[PDB]
């Protein structure tokens, strides 16, 4: 428990239940005097896991296309900053294999399917392996805890061989990489809101010229 900016209302409930408790919570949210719905410590660990994972995937993906465009062979047809890809209309757009809006509602419906089923599992664990699902039924029981589902659909290669220690390592790795990807995503987006040129080009910049130091300018522009 490497104490970085802790408090006592943190230690009221942060007693070391989350894998690798570092003790950093000044505010003391999940005090268990009255358990707030969705403020449950279980729900908090669940949320940090899910958010960090999504942030890992996002920091890989948003940066992938243009970056690869640099000295790679993904065409310049998509050499566009993630914040200019089209998600931000005041930045850019693109002609796709559908129209914008219906595409968005369609992907929303799909992600909704997935996350609704996951939440229903959260309420009643294991309870997805009962109803007809056109197959897939004998897999979605999970590994008990909705935090960690397991299953050969989500455990292909096979790790944590005969172990909980290996799972503890792999998993610390999980929390650390999630937090790092969170930081990197937030930084890319803040540069984008204040710089206006794109992350990978910002690396192109900060490889040679040290004098950049654009906190000195603090120039706020689109």
């Amino acid at each position: 428990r490497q104490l970085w900016f802790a408090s006592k209302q943190s230690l009221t409930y942060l007693d070391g239940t989350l894998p690798g408790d570092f003790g950093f919570d000044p505010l003391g949210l999940s005090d268990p005097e009255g358990t707030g719905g969705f403020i449950e410590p279980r729900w908090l660990a669940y949320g940090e896991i899910f958010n960090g994972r999504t942030a890992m995937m996002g920091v890989v993906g948003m940066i992938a296309p243009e970056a690869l465009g640099k000295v790679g062979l993904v065409p310049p047809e998509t050499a566009i900053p993630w914040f200019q890809a089209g998600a931000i209309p005041p930045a850019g757009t693109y002609q796709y294999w559908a129209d914008p809006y219906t595409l968005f509602v369609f992907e929303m419906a799909l992600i909704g399917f997935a996350e609704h089923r996951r939440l229903q599992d959260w309420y009643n664990p294991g309870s997805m392996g009962k109803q007809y699902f056109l197959g897939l039924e004998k897999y979605l029981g999970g590994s008990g805890d909705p935090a960690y589902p397991g299953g050969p659909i989500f455990n292909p290669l096979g790790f944590g061989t005969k172990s909980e220690k290996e799972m503890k390592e792999l998993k610390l790795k999980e929390i650390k990489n999630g937090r790092l990807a969170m930081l990197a995503f937030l930084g890319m987006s803040l540069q984008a809101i204040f710089t206006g040129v794109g992350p990978f080009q910002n690396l192109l910049d900060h490889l040679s010229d040290p004098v950049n130091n654009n906190i000195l300018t603090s120039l706020k522009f689109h």
Binding site: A98, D99, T102, Q120, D121, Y123, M128, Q131, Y132
Partner: protein, 211 residues
């Protein structure tokens, strides 16, 4: 009469949820979907079941009458134009005469049916030659060789509840289809096949969000 209580025999409309206890699943087409609990008491339950069956059958007839003539116009010989504008089509007689005749005859019929609902078996049409015992009723399924001359609603071709399930499901779907057709004509100015083909040509853009 077969029951569909909880368990694997009960595929819940909302996975991972216990259906409302007063939703047993006897009525074919049941999946435990009544968050508003309108079926709380049994008399309301049967009343709503009758309403659902009637709506489903009438919606099937309506959607058939919309669909078939429009496609037989598009490609077939006779050209039945916009059905939504067929309501004001000009015939031999005025619309009010048609209305009053419809109301008279349908009042007669639906009133006999209403009395049958209120008093089962007391208003039925099933002749009886000697020594051949007639069938009973299950209101909503009159039976006898007036509305079941194919002998489908009784046994042999399929266990009953399965066929009634087919009927109620197709009826819900047809209700959706009718309200969709009407709402489209409110928004767009073509028939269902026209919207269909327009969507086929340009699936990516030719949609509601096309404007």
């Amino acid at each position: 009469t077969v029951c569909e209580p909880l368990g694997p025999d009960r595929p819940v409309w909302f996975p991972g949820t216990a259906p409302p206890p007063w939703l047993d699943g006897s009525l074919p087409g049941d999946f435990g979907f009544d968050p508003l609990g309108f079926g709380s008491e049994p008399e309301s339950l049967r009343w709503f079941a009758q309403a659902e069956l009637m709506h489903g059958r009438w919606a099937m007839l309506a959607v058939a009458g919309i669909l078939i003539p429009e496609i037989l116009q598009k490609w077939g010989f006779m050209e039945e134009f916009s059905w939504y504008t067929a309501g004001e089509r000009e015939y031999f007689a005025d619309p009010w005469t048609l209305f009053v005749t419809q109301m008279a005859l349908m009042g007669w019929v639906e009133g006999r049916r209403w009395m049958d609902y209120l008093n089962p078996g007391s208003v039925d049409i099933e002749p009886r030659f000697p020594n051949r015992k007639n069938p009973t009723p299950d209101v909503g399924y009159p039976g006898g060789l007036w509305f079941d001359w194919g002998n489908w609603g009784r046994g042999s071709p399929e266990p009953v509840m399965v066929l009634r399930t087919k009927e109620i499901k197709n009826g819900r779907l047809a209700m959706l289809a009718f309200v969709g057709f009407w709402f489209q004509v409110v928004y767009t100015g073509q028939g269902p096949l026209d919207n269909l083909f327009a969507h086929l040509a340009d699936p990516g853009h030719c949609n509601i969000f096309s404007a």
